[PDB]
């Protein structure tokens, strides 16, 4: 149903489990036969990663006009490292 992701400053992000599986990293962790600690990711980054999950699940296989996923220059480097770490 939902998974709880924890950021480095202790913000808790509760997202649908199907959405969280957008992350190859999370998908492999939860793939066996819930809370996940992401203490290396600050909340201004992890909140954007969760928005990405929603956006990927909404717009993948969609024939609508797809809006740009917005990224402010000042979060780009950390978000890039999170996306890389998270595989999404």
């Amino acid at each position: 149903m939902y998974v709880k992701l924890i950021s480095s400053d202790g913000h808790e992000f509760i997202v649908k489990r199907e959405h969280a599986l957008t992350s190859g990293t999370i998908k492999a962790m939860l793939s066996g036969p819930n809370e996940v600690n992401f203490r290396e990711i600050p909340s201004h980054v992890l909140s954007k990663v969760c928005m990405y999950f929603t956006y990927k699940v909404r717009y993948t296989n969609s024939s609508t006009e797809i809006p740009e996923f917005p990224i402010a220059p000042e979060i780009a480097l950390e978000l890039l490292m999170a996306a890389n770490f998270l595989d999404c």
Partner: peptide
């Protein structure tokens, strides 16, 4: 636009 990966989108920016 396609749905880029987040990683690809960050590299774009």
């Amino acid at each position: 636009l396609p749905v880029y990966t987040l990683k690809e989108r960050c590299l774009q920016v």
